[PDB]
Design an enzyme around this catalytic site. Structure first.
Site, PDB file in Angstrom:
ATOM      1  N   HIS A   1       0.801  -1.241   0.000  1.00  0.00           N
ATOM      2  CA  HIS A   1       0.000   0.000   0.000  1.00  0.00           C
ATOM      3  C   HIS A   1       0.829   1.285   0.000  1.00  0.00           C
ATOM      4  O   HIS A   1       0.309   2.371  -0.276  1.00  0.00           O
ATOM      5  CB  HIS A   1      -1.046   0.015   1.126  1.00  0.00           C
TER       6      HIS A   1
ATOM      7  N   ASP B   1      -0.520  -7.351   2.073  1.00  0.00           N
ATOM      8  CA  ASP B   1       0.132  -6.026   2.098  1.00  0.00           C
ATOM      9  C   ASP B   1       1.651  -6.216   2.217  1.00  0.00           C
ATOM     10  O   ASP B   1       2.255  -6.081   3.314  1.00  0.00           O
ATOM     11  CB  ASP B   1      -0.432  -5.127   3.212  1.00  0.00           C
TER      12      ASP B   1
ATOM     13  N   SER C   1       4.167   2.806   8.118  1.00  0.00           N
ATOM     14  CA  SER C   1       3.794   1.771   7.154  1.00  0.00           C
ATOM     15  C   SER C   1       4.963   1.283   6.304  1.00  0.00           C
ATOM     16  O   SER C   1       5.801   2.073   5.855  1.00  0.00           O
ATOM     17  CB  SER C   1       2.652   2.257   6.252  1.00  0.00           C
ATOM     18  N   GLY C   2       5.014  -0.030   6.104  1.00  0.00           N
ATOM     19  CA  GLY C   2       6.091  -0.652   5.359  1.00  0.00           C
ATOM     20  C   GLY C   2       7.301  -0.974   6.216  1.00  0.00           C
ATOM     21  O   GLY C   2       8.153  -1.778   5.815  1.00  0.00           O
TER      22      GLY C   2
HETATM   23  O1  LIG Z   1      -4.369   2.752   8.559  1.00  0.00           O
HETATM   24  C1  LIG Z   1      -5.263   3.511   8.900  1.00  0.00           C
HETATM   25  C2  LIG Z   1      -5.045   4.851   9.614  1.00  0.00           C
HETATM   26  N1  LIG Z   1      -3.886   5.559   9.087  1.00  0.00           N
HETATM   27  S1  LIG Z   1      -2.567   5.852   9.979  1.00  0.00           S
HETATM   28  O2  LIG Z   1      -1.686   6.427   9.020  1.00  0.00           O
HETATM   29  O3  LIG Z   1      -2.878   6.568  11.182  1.00  0.00           O
HETATM   30  C3  LIG Z   1      -1.826   4.318  10.448  1.00  0.00           C
HETATM   31  C4  LIG Z   1      -1.162   3.613   9.429  1.00  0.00           C
HETATM   32  C5  LIG Z   1      -0.538   2.407   9.743  1.00  0.00           C
HETATM   33  C6  LIG Z   1      -0.587   1.927  11.066  1.00  0.00           C
HETATM   34  C7  LIG Z   1       0.031   0.717  11.380  1.00  0.00           C
HETATM   35  C8  LIG Z   1      -0.013   0.252  12.689  1.00  0.00           C
HETATM   36 CL1  LIG Z   1       0.788  -1.256  12.991  1.00  0.00          CL
HETATM   37  C9  LIG Z   1      -0.678   0.957  13.713  1.00  0.00           C
HETATM   38  C10 LIG Z   1      -1.293   2.147  13.415  1.00  0.00           C
HETATM   39  C11 LIG Z   1      -1.263   2.648  12.087  1.00  0.00           C
HETATM   40  C12 LIG Z   1      -1.888   3.875  11.749  1.00  0.00           C
HETATM   41  C13 LIG Z   1      -6.355   5.576   9.355  1.00  0.00           C
HETATM   42  C14 LIG Z   1      -7.382   4.468   9.158  1.00  0.00           C
HETATM   43  N2  LIG Z   1      -6.596   3.319   8.727  1.00  0.00           N
HETATM   44  C15 LIG Z   1      -7.178   2.119   8.200  1.00  0.00           C
HETATM   45  C16 LIG Z   1      -8.258   1.526   8.872  1.00  0.00           C
HETATM   46  C17 LIG Z   1      -8.840   0.355   8.386  1.00  0.00           C
HETATM   47  C18 LIG Z   1      -8.366  -0.266   7.231  1.00  0.00           C
HETATM   48  C19 LIG Z   1      -9.035  -1.519   6.712  1.00  0.00           C
HETATM   49  C20 LIG Z   1      -8.097  -2.427   5.906  1.00  0.00           C
HETATM   50  C21 LIG Z   1      -8.366  -2.064   4.443  1.00  0.00           C
HETATM   51  C22 LIG Z   1      -9.608  -1.161   4.454  1.00  0.00           C
HETATM   52  N3  LIG Z   1     -10.160  -1.222   5.812  1.00  0.00           N
HETATM   53  C23 LIG Z   1      -7.290   0.320   6.555  1.00  0.00           C
HETATM   54  C24 LIG Z   1      -6.719   1.477   7.045  1.00  0.00           C
HETATM   55  F1  LIG Z   1      -5.690   1.971   6.360  1.00  0.00           F
END
Ligand SMILES: O=C1[C@@H](NS(=O)(=O)c2ccc3cc(Cl)ccc3c2)CCN1c1ccc([C@@H]2CCCN2)cc1F
Ligand SMILES: [Ca+2]
Ligand SMILES: [Mg+2]
Lengths: 52, 234
Positions: free
Chosen positions: B42, B88, B185-186
């Site tokens: 992603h 992913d 992420s990643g």
């Molecule tokens: O990843 C995030 C958040 N973004 S973030 O940048 O704050 C984030 C990104 C990666 C993370 C990885 C971990 Cl391990 C913990 C927190 C994280 C927070 C907002 C909502 N969100 C998010 C919520 C639910 C899903 C699911 C799976 C596919 C579609 N529905 C996907 C998402 F990207």
């Protein structure tokens, strides 16, 4: 707990149970030591080691 | 990373940072070897073109150990979908090899069976990155790491509003305010065993960052070990 379930079979890294016996191995960049348990880095910057 | 600590000198040498056209980090990666970086599929939609930076702990200075690498081949998992974030995972082949040194080293790839029985049954793993330090905030300028507990699979399914597939696992805390976050992420999820760090996950997603009743969701690296191997052979 026996073999690989008993303290990783005394192996440094990977532990397999071939027959009713422990067999240790190591990740790429490591050679299995003479004792067949320890993992020895083959060259500089072996994987998984924090630096200095 | 929300909470946790600064990665001190030589503590997180497998960290890679994907940087865009404006030298800004947008995702993490794990150094697998001199030519290969592990990251999340992603992340490949977040930038037109990008390069990979290694040996960096502070984005504000030149610590002398930094090195930028251009990507030669992007190997995205074909089964990845934006709908569920299943599969992913992506592997990057670099144009030039990484020179290992202080702060630049690969994490080990474990064997599946041993990793699942011995690494993923450990109490904790370690996640790291230059991501946000609070759900709302800017990217961290310092590389951070955080010890995150492995979460019972059943508890994780219960807590999640979205489907937790077999290519995913959960780590972190129910209420304690520590977790990965945006920009992480990643990045590496590694597990320590007798002073050797093995790659066990890829920072994938979360419903916000460090929310009560929610955990960090990571790609289960053990499920893609053969795929990673094939991907590295060419
Ligand atoms: O990843 C995030 C958040 N973004 S973030 O940048 O704050 C984030 C990104 C990666 C993370 C990885 C971990 Cl391990 C913990 C927190 C994280 C927070 C907002 C909502 N969100 C998010 C919520 C639910 C899903 C699911 C799976 C596919 C579609 N529905 C996907 C998402 F990207
Ligand atoms: Ca720097
Ligand atoms: Mg939580």
């Amino acid at each position: 707990r026996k073999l690989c379930s008993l303290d990783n079979g005394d192996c440094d890294q990977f532990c397999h149970e071939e027959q009713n016996s422990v067999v240790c191995s190591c990740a790429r960049g490591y050679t299995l030591a003479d004792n067949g348990k320890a993992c020895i880095p083959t060259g500089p910057y072996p994987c998984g080691k924090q630096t200095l | 990373i929300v909470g946790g600590q600064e990665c001190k000198d030589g503590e997180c040498p497998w960290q890679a940072l994907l940087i865009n056209e404006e030298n800004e980090g947008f995702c993490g990666g794990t150094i697998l070897s001199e030519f290969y970086i592990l990251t999340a599929a992603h992340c490949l939609y977040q930038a037109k073109r990008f390069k990979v930076r290694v040996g960096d702990r502070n984005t504000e200075q030149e610590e002398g150990g930094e090195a930028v690498h251009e990507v030669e081949v992007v190997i995205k998992h074909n089964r990845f979908t934006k709908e569920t974030y299943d599969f992913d995972i992506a592997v990057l082949r670099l144009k030039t090899p990484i020179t290992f040194r202080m702060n630049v080293a690969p994490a080990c790839l474990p064997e599946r069976d041993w990793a699942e029985s011995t690494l993923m049954t450990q109490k904790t793993g370690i996640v790291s990155g230059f991501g946000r330090t609070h759900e709302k905030g800017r990217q961290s300028t310092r590389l951070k790491m955080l010890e995150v507990p492995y979460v019972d699979r059943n508890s994780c399914k219960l807590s999640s509003s979205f489907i937790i597939t077999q290519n995913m696992f959960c780590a972190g805390y129910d209420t304690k305010q520590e977790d990965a976050c945006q920009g992480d992420s990643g990045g590496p999820h590694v597990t320590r065993f007798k002073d050797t760090y093995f790659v066990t996950g890829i920072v994938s997603w979360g419903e916000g960052c460090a929310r009560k009743g929610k955990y960090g969701i990571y790609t289960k690296v053990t499920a893609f070990l053969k795929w990673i191997d094939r991907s590295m052979k060419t």
